[model samples]
Target: KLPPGWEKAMSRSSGRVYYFNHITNASQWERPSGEPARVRCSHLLVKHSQSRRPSSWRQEKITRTKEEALELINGYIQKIKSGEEDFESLASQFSDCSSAKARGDLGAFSRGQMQKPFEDASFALRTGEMSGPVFTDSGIHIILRTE
Candidate 1:
């Protein structure tokens, strides 16, 4: 049998066993070794003292140090992996970006829409994958790619 979210069908002409993935809507002749299940792409951002604006909708006047923000982001990551908290919940509660209220919903964008680091890290993630701390001019972010 094929992997979860994967389907195999006989090719129309060659009778080859083609492969498909429902998770990310991809196709390949050879079976994929990785995996996925759509969860929607949302992100969590934490801005620090070095952040360009040093201010977010959640905090009018940012006073936290750089280390403080990193610790906070790391703490959030810890809770998430521990299954003690949900990604959207944590983002809504503590993300420094104005997107916090929207649950860090950047939605979709073209290639140049986001900074190099953020876009690169986000794109590097396969469906259902999450990124570690990614640094950009905006701040540190944890990218969750579900599409």
Candidate 2:
């Protein structure tokens, strides 16, 4: 048996088994022996007209309203959760974030390097977890905690 609300799951991308603690909202990426710090994340950012750097790959001038961007993020979340789409493609092709070039890869980074909301959400995300809409000064995002 595993921890409360914790269960064994597989990574669709890596095809490896890992333990996830739904209760703790954390993951050890192994047989729950213990834990540590640092995180690798990838995210799809949908920029709204309000973002200071509103212009992105989608268009030279982002004219969409925040409502529109939020709606798109919601749609992407559904596709991601449903397994109908891969985060790599969705982020690279649609996410306005330049990190999409590496498939939304932000690499392994520590605290104090990013916007508070972004880093906070990244910190809370369990290993191999996918986050809901995360809003930051740059844009709205869907985070995948890869490591």
Candidate 3:
């Protein structure tokens, strides 16, 4: 049985179970039949010319060249690798996505919910594995698969 305020729902793209809370207009995954219900992930983004515009209606062209952005991302990668900084903190400080507010949490998603490149990179990771920079139409991303 569902909890006090939960309603059943399914992801359109992946057919995974999710619970919707009408009061909050928020939804979250329910444990799936066989696989883990959700995979927790955080990411850092660096935008370039091919980056998609932000969804918030506010927009700005990333002034830095791709080379410069890559350089900056590499620096963050180094810090993460050396244990100097964690992915959540760096994502909040630097990612372009609104998920930054939640420390770059993309929450739990099943495969196919994200962009193809992002999905591929995310699923390939083992728990606690940090990915190298992954380029997508949205931006360059460095992912940490938490679960």
Cα lDDT tens digits for candidate 1, 4-36: 656887788998888765443335678756522
TM-score of 3: 0.69
Q: State each model's CA lDDT, in order.
A: 0.73, 0.81, 0.72
Q: Rank the candidates by TM-score, best first.
A: 2, 1, 3
Clashing pairs in 1: none
User: For candidate 3, lDDT tens digit of each residue in 1-147?
Assistant: 655434789789998878664432234564312135568888888876656763321236666667776888889988987789988888888887888888888888997688877777676655876677777788788888888
2-60 per-residue lDDT for model 2 (tens digits)? 64446898988898898775433344466753233688999899999999798987789
TM-score of each: 0.71, 0.75, 0.69
> What C-alpha lDDT does candidate 3 achieve relative to the native structure?
0.72
All-Cα superposition RMSD per candidate: 11.4, 7.3, 13.6
Q: Work out how many backbone clashes candidate 1 has.
A: 0
Better candidate by lDDT, 1 or 3: 1
Question: Which is the leading candidate under lDDT?
Answer: 2
Error of 1 at 137 (Å): 0.8
